[PDB]
Structures are given as structure tokens and as C-alpha cells.
Amino acid sequence: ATRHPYPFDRAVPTAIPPLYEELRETERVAAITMATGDPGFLVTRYEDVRFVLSDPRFSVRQDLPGAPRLTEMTFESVMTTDPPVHTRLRRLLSRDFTARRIERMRPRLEEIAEGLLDEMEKKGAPADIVESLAVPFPITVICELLGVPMVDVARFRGWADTMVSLTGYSMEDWTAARDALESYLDGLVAAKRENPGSDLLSALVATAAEDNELTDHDVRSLSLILLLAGYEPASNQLGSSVLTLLRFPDRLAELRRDPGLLPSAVEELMRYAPAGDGALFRVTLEDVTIGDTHIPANSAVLASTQAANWDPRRFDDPTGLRLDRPDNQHTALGHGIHFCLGAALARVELQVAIGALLRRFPRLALATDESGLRWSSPGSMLSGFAEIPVTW
Ligand code: HEM
Numbered sequence: 001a002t003r004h005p006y007p008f009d010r011a012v013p014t015a016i017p018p019l020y021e022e023l024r025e026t027e028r029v030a031a032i033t034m035a036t037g038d039p040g041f042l043v044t045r046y047e048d049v050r051f052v053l054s055d056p057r058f059s060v061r062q063d064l065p066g067a068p069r070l071t072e073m074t075f076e077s078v079m080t081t082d083p084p085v086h087t088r089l090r091r092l093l094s095r096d097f098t099a100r101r102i103e104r105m106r107p108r109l110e111e112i113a114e115g116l117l118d119e120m121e122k123k124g125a126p127a128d129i130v131e132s133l134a135v136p137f138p139i140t141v142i143c144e145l146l147g148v149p150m151v152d153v154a155r156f157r158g159w160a161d162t163m164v165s166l167t168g169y170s171m172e173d174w175t176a177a178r179d180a181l182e183s184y185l186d187g188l189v190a191a192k193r194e195n196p197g198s199d200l201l202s203a204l205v206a207t208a209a210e211d212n213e214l215t216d217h218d219v220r221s222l223s224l225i226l227l228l229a230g231y232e233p234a235s236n237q238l239g240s241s242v243l244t245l246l247r248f249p250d251r252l253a254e255l256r257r258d259p260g261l262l263p264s265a266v267e268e269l270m271r272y273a274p275a276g277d278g279a280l281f282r283v284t285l286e287d288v289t290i291g292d293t294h295i296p297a298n299s300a301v302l303a304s305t306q307a308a309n310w311d312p313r314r315f316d317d318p319t320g321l322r323l324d325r326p327d328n329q330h331t332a333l334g335h336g337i338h339f340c341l342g343a344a345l346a347r348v349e350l351q352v353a354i355g356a357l358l359r360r361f362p363r364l365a366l367a368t369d370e371s372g373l374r375w376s377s378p379g380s381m382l383s384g385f386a387e388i389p390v391t392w
């Protein structure tokens with residue numbers, strides 16, 4: 001079997017990279033060469049993707065000695081570790097992120113989304129869904145939640161867009177963004193201790209004051225990951241989901257005439273449209289066998305949620321769009337102990353923004369032809385479209 005260059009490319013910007021599907025149909029565990037040159041393995045089938053993401057012999061750590069590297073661009077993510085430390089940090093954050101807790105945020109989220117739609121109507125059609133909605137909505141939600149002041153949202157956006165671009169920026173430019181953001185965050189931690197607010201970063205800081213094993217540096221790392229993860233995938237997801245509905249107008253119509261379909265339609269939209277083309281990264285802590293493939297300890301094993309969510313072994317007519325698809329346990333939010341901390345938040349965000357968008361614009365339509373669309377970051381873990389021009 002050949003060794004394939006990773007990451008993979010899209011042919012047509014609206015469909016996931018075809019090599020994912022080719023491998024999924026032909027090779028249970030594929031051989032790859034990552035962007036650093038190091039060799040890795042790749043699973044694409046639904047059951048294998050779940051397995052790799054959940055099994056305790058697979059580490060999320062990217063700092064294991066002698067282990068192959070996905071990238072050379074790294075940042076310290078205290079939460080991106082294995083247990084028992086991971087479990088402690090999870091226990092630290094997870095109460096604030098249940099469905100019940102997030103549900104309290106729904107009315108505020110409605111206000112934010114309604115305002116952004118108001119702005120859209122004020123500049124008139126056509127509008128770019130990305131800049132008008134997909135970016136400001138989750139970036140505002142996550143900044144308010146964590147306690148970042150509105151006046152620093154633009155700078156944060158710059159740093160964040162830089163850090164999640166695993167390609168297209170040099171070491172120096174990338175590292176500058178990383179250091180700028182961390183430094184900003186140490187400053188914010190400071191300010192939050194100095195003058196507490198009703199936000200989450202305050203509570204974290206207060207907690208750290210009383211716990212000498214929970215450093216300000218830890219809180220900084222947590223806030224960093226919460227900002228990146230809280231803004232980027234959601235931003236990509238909201239736009240691609242909107243685009244997807246516009247590409248399936250009968251489904252769009254169905255959804256506008258029955259808002260009860262909104263929660264399940266959001267799950268399907270995450271299954272159909274990935275927030276990026278990067279496969280999730282693991283490293284083996286011991287020897288593991290998957291089928292005929294014997295994977296030695298300290299090997300890189302990548303798991304494609306994109307391929308898995310289109311796996312016809314698990315989903316009927318996977319290239320189709322079913323708003324109330326039964327048994328829709330897609331992998332877009334991960335699986336196991338690292339399952340997305342912001343699952344409920346992402347769900348509510350998507351439901352609110354899409355529902356509002358649809359209420360406002362009963363004749364919403366793509367202002368362009370699909371052939372005009374472009375895929376923004378082919379070499380990065382996360383990616384959306386350059387623009388999504390709409391009219392109403
Ligand atoms: C407000 C929105 C979000 C927040 C606050 C958030 C936060 C986080 C955090 C902190 C983690 C690390 C969890 C851990 O290691 O224990 C995580 C994991 C993850 N998130 Fe989210 N996230 C958000 C939205 C999204 C969206 C929209 C997607 C995809 C469409 C997504 C996909 C994932 C996946 C796949 C993982 C697992 C990573 C892995 O298994 O290696 N997240 N999220």
C-alpha cells in the first residue's frame with residue numbers, strides 16, 4: 001500500500017476531500033506522511049474513528065518524546081493531555097457546560113443574533129454570511145462568556161485566525177500571535193483577580209487563588225483553549241451549515257415550516273458539513289492491533305471525523321441531507337473523555353443563529369452560483385469558505 005501525503009485536498013469546494021472516501025472504502029488503516037515529514041496512520045471508518053478517539057491506549061498528547069509530529073506549530077494546552085490530569089481539568093470546567101446551564105444563555109444568544117441580523121438589513125443585500133454572522137456570533141458569545149472585553153475582540157480575532165492556520169504563516173508570525181495572545185491573557189487573568197466580574201475567567205482565577213496546584217499559568221492555558229475552540233470551529237460550522245441549507249432548498253423550506261426540526265437539523269448539519277478537513281490526532285501508548293494492521297507503540301494515528309460521518313456502513317445515503325435522521329450519533333463533536341466541552345453551547349448557538357436567520361429572511365438565497373465558492377484553508381486543521389454571499 002502507498003504512503004499518502006497529509007493533509008488532503010478537496011476537488012470541488014463543497015465536498016470533503018475525496019481521498020478520505022477512497023481510503024475508507026479500500027484501507028482500514030492507511031499509511032500517511034504528515035506535513036512535517038513524519039509517518040502516521042489514518043482511520044476513516046466510523047467504528048474505527050470512534051475506537052481511536054475513545055480508547056485509553058491512544059494519547060492526545062503532542063509532546064511525547066520521539067513521537068511523530070502533526071505540526072511544528074505548537075502551543076501549550078494543559079487540557080490536551082491524558083488522565084489523571086485531564087480528568088481534573090475536565091472536572092474543573094464541565095459543570096459550567098451542561099445542557100441545563102447553557103440553556104440559561106439562550107435569551108442572551110437570541111439578542112446577539114437578532115442584532116447581527118439588524119445590521120445585515122441596514123447595509124442591504126447582498127451580504128457575506130461569514131463576516132455578518134458566522135464570525136461575530138460565536139466570537140461574541142465566547143468572549144462574553146470568558147470575560148474578554150468587546151474592545152479587544154478584533155485583536156483576539158487576529159491572533160486566533162493566525163494560530164488555527166497550520167499553514168500559510170511562517171514560524172515567526174505564528175509564534176508572535178501565540179505569544180501576543182498568551183501575554184494578553186496573563187494580563188486579563190491579572191485584571192480579573194484585581195477586579196472580578198460575572199464571567200467564567202473570574203471564577204477560574206478565584207479558584208486558582210485557593211488552589212496552589214492550579215496556577216495562573218494553568219488558568220491562562222484553559223482560557224486560551226476555550227477561546228480558540230469556542231470561536232473557530234463554531235464560526236466555520238455556522239457558515240457551512242447555512243450554505244448547506246441553501247444547497248438543499250427543499251430541506252430549508254421543510255425546516256422553516258417546522259422549527260421543531262431545528263435541534264435535529266443541527267446534528268445533521270454537523271454530520272454533513274465538517275468544521276474543517278483536519279483529522280483528529282492520537283499517539284499510541286502501547287502496541288495496538290486494528291484488523292490486519294499492527295500499530296507499534298509511539299505511532300501517530302489520525303482519525304477522520306469527516307470520513308466517518310459519511311460512512312455508508314453507519315449512515316444511509318450519507319451524501320444526502322435528512323433533518324430528522326434517526327440514530328444520528330455523528331463524530332463531529334468527538335467521542336469519549338475528550339468529547340467537546342462546548343457540545344451544548346455549539347448546539348444552542350447553531351439552533352439560535354439558524355432559526356433567527358430563517359425567521360428574518362423567508363426568501364434567503366445564495367447571491368452567487370455554487371461554482372464561485374472557495375475553500376479557505378486547505379492545509380489547516382480548521383477551515384470554512386472565503387465568503388457566502390446571500391440575498392433576500
Ligand atoms: C462554543 C463552542 C465550543 C467550545 C466552548 C468548545 C470547547 C472545546 C474544548 C475545551 C475541547 C477540549 C475538551 C477536552 O479535551 O476535554 C473541545 C473538544 C472538541 N471539540 Fe469543541 N468547542 C466548541 C465548539 C465546537 C464545534 C462547533 C465543533 C465541531 C463542529 C467542535 C468539535 C470538537 C471536537 C471534535 C473535540 C474533540 C477533540 C479530540 O477528540 O481530539 N467543538 N471543544
